[PDB]
Short mmCIF file of C-alpha atoms and ligand atoms in Angstrom, two decimals:
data_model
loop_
_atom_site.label_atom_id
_atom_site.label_comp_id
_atom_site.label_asym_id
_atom_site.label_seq_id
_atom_site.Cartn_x
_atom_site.Cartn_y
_atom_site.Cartn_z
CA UNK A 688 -39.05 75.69 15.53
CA UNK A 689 -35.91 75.15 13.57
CA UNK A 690 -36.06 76.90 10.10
CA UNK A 691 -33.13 75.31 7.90
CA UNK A 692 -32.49 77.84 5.26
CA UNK A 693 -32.51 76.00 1.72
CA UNK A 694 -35.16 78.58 1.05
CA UNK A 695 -35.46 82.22 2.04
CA UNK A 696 -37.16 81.84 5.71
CA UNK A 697 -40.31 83.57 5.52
CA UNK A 698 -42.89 83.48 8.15
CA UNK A 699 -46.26 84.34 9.28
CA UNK A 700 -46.74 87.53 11.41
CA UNK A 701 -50.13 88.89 13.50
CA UNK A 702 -49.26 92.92 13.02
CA UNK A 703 -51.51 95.88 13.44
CA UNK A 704 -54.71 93.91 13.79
CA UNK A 705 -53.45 91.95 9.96
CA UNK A 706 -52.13 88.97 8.83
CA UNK A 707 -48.75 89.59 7.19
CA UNK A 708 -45.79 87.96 6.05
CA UNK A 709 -41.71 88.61 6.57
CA UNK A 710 -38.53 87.80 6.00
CA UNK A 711 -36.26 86.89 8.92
CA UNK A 712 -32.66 88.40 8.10
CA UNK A 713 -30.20 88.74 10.31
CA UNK A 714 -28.56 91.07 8.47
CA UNK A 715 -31.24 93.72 8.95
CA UNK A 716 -30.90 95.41 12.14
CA UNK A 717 -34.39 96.65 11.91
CA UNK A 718 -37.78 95.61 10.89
CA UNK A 719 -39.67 96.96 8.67
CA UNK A 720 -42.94 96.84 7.31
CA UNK A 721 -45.34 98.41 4.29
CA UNK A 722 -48.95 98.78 4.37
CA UNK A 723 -49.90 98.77 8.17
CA UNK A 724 -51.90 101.09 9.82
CA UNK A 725 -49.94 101.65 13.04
CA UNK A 726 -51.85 103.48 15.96
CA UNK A 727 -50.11 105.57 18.09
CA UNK A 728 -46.92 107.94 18.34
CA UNK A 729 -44.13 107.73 15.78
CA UNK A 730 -41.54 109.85 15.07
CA UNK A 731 -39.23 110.30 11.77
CA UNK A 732 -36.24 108.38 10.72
CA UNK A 733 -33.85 108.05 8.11
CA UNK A 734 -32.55 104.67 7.35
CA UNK A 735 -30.83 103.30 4.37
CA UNK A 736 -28.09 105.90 3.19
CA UNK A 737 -26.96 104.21 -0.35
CA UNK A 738 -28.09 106.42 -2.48
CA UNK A 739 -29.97 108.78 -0.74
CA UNK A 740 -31.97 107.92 2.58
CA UNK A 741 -35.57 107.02 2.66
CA UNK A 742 -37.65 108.39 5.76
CA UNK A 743 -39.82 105.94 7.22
CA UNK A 744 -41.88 106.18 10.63
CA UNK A 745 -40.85 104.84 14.02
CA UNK A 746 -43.56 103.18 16.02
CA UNK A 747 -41.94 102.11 19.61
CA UNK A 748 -42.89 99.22 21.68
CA UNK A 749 -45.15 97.87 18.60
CA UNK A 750 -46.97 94.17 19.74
CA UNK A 751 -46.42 92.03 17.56
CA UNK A 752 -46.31 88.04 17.10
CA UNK A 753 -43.87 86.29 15.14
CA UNK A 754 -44.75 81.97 14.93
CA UNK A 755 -47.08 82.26 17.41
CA UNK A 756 -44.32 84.21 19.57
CA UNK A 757 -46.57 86.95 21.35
CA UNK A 758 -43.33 90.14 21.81
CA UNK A 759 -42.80 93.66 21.35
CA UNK A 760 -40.40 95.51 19.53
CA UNK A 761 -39.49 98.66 17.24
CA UNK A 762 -41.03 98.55 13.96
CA UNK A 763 -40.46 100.81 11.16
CA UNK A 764 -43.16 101.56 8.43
CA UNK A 765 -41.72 102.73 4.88
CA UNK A 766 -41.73 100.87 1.24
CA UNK A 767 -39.89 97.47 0.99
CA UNK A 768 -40.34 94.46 -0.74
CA UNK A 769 -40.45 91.95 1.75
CA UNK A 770 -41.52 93.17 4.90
CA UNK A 771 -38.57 92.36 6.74
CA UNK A 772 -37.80 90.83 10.41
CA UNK A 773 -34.63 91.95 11.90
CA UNK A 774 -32.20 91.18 14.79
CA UNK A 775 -34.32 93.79 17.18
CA UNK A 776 -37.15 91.50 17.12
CA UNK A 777 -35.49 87.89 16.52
CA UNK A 778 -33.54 88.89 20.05
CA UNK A 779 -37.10 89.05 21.54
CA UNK A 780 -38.17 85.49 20.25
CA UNK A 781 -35.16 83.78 21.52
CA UNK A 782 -33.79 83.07 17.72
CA UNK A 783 -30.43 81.66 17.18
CA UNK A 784 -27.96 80.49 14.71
CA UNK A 785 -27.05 77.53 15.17
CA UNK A 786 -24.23 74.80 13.53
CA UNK B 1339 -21.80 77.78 17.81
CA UNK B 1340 -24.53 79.44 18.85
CA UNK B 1341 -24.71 82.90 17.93
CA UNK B 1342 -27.59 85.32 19.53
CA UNK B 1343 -28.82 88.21 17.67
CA UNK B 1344 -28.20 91.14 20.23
CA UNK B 1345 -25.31 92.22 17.81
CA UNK B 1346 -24.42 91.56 14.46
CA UNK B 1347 -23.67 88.05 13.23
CA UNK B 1348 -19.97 88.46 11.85
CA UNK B 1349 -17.27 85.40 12.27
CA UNK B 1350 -14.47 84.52 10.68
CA UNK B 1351 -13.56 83.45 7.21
CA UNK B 1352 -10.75 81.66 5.17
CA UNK B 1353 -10.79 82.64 1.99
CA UNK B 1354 -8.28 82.92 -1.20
CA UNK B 1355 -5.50 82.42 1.17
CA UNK B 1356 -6.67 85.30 3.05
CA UNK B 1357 -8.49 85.77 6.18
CA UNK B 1358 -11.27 87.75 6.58
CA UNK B 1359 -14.64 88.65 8.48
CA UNK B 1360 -18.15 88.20 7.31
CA UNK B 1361 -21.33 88.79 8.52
CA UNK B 1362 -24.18 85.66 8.29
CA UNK B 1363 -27.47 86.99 6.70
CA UNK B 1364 -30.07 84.91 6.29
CA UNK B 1365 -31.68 87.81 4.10
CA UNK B 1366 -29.20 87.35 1.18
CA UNK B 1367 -29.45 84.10 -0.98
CA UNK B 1368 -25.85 84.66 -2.55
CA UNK B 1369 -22.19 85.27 -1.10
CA UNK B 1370 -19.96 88.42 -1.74
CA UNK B 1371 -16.79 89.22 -0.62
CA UNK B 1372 -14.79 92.19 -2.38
CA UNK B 1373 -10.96 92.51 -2.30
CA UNK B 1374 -10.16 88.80 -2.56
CA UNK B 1375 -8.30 87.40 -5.36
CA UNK B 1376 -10.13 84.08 -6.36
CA UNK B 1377 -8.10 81.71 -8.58
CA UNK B 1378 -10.26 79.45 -11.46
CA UNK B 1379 -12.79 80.65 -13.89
CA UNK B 1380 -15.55 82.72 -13.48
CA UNK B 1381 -18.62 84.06 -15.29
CA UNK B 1382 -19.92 87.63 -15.02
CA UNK B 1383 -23.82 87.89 -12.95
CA UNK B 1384 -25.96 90.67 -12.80
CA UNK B 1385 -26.98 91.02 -9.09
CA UNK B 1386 -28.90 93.52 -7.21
CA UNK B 1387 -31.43 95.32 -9.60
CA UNK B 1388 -32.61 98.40 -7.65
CA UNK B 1389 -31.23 101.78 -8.52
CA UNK B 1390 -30.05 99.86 -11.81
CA UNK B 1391 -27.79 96.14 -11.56
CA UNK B 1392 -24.42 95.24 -10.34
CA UNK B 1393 -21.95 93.37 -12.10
CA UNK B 1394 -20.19 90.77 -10.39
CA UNK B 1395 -17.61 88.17 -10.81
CA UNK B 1396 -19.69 84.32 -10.05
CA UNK B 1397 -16.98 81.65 -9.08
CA UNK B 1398 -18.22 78.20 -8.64
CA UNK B 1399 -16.85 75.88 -5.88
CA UNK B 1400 -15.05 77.77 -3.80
CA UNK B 1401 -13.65 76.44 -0.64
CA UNK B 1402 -14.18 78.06 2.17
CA UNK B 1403 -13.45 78.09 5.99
CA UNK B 1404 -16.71 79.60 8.33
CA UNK B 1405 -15.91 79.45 12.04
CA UNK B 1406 -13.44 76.38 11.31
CA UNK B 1407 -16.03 74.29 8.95
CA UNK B 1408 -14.41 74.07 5.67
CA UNK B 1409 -17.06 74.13 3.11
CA UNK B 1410 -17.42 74.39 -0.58
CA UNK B 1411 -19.86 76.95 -2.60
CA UNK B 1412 -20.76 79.64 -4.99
CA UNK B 1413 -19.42 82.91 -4.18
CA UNK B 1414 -19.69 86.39 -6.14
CA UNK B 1415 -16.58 89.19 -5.67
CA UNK B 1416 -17.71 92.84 -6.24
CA UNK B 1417 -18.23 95.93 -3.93
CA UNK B 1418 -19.90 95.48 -0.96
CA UNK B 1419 -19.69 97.40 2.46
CA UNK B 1420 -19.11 94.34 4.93
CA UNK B 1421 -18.69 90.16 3.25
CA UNK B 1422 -21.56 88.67 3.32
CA UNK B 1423 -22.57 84.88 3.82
CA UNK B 1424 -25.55 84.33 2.38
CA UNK B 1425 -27.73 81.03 2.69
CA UNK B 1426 -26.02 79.12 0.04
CA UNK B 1427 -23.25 78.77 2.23
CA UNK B 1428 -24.92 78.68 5.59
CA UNK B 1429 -26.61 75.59 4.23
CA UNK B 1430 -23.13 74.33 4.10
CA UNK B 1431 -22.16 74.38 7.21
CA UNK B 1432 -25.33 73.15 8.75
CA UNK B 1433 -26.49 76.61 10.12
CA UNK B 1434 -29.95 77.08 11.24
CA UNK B 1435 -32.50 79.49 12.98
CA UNK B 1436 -34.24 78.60 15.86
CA UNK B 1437 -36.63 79.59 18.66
C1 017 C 1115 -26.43 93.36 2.77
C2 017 C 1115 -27.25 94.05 3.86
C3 017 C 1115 -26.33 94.84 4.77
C4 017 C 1115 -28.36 94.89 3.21
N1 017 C 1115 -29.68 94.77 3.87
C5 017 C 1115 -30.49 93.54 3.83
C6 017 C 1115 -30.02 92.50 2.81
O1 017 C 1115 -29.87 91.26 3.52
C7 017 C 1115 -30.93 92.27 1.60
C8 017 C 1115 -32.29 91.71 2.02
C9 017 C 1115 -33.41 92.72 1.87
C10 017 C 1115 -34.72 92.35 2.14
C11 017 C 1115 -35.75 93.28 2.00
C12 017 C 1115 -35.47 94.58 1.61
C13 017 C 1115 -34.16 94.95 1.35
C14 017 C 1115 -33.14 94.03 1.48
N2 017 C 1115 -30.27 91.36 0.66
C15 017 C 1115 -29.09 91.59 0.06
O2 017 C 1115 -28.74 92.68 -0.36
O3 017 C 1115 -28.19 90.45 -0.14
C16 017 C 1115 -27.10 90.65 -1.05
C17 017 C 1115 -25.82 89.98 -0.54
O4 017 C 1115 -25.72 88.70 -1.20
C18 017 C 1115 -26.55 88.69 -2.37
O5 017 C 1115 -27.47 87.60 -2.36
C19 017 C 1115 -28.80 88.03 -2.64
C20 017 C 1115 -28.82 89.54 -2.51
C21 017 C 1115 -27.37 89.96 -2.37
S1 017 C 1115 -30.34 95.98 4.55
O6 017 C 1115 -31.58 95.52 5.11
O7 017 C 1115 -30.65 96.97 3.56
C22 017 C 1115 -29.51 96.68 5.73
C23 017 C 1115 -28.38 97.45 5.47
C24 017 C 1115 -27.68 98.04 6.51
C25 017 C 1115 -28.12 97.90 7.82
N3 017 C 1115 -27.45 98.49 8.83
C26 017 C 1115 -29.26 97.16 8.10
C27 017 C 1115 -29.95 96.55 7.05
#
């Protein structure tokens, strides 16, 4: 699709067997989400840094779909108000800027 | 342009007679730049509002030059780590996400 950005672009995601919601912002590097149940490993890691750092959990190779884009990607579980699509997992649905 | 993801989004800016870099962020609805020296009137905005608020300096219509398209819009000085260019001027230049 192409998502003109009058508004903020929120979209619909399929993660951790729920229906969710998230920002796209390509000026996150990382995506991150609050209240999922992630199965699997994860490991510790400290993000932010203004102001202190928060800790969050690491879950690797996390499927996930994103518009009805099936991929897989790092996703990072901690408090946020948006749950929050970065640039790790707009690389893996082909998303541009474009003008 | 088109501008992939798999690093961040930062281009080139005229600004206040100066040039300087930016990085597009489709997460941010305003623009900030610190160290430029707008001319014109402004009006003080609170921005931010976690950990307390930030004042800023709001200057209306302000040209500006993004990758060579010389636009006009809204943009706040105050602290910030790296310029930002947030959708109120993206929408100014015509930029888009797609996939
Ligand atoms: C400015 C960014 C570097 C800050 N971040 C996201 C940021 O886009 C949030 C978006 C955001 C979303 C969810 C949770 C936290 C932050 N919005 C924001 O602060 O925009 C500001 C700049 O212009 C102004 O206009 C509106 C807000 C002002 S960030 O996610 O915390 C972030 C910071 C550093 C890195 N490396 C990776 C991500």
């Amino acid at each position: 699709p192409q998502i003109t950005l009058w508004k903020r672009p929120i979209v619909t995601i399929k993660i951790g067997g729920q229906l969710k919601e998230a920002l796209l912002n390509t000026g996150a590097d990382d995506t991150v989400f609050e209240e999922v149940n992630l199965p699997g490993r994860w490991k510790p890691k400290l993000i932010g840094g203004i102001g202190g750092f928060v800790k969050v959990r690491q879950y690797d190779q996390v499927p996930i779909e994103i518009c009805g884009h099936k991929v897989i990607g790092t996703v990072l579980v901690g408090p946020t108000p948006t749950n929050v699509i970065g640039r790790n997992l707009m690389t893996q649905i082909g998303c541009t800027l474009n003008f």
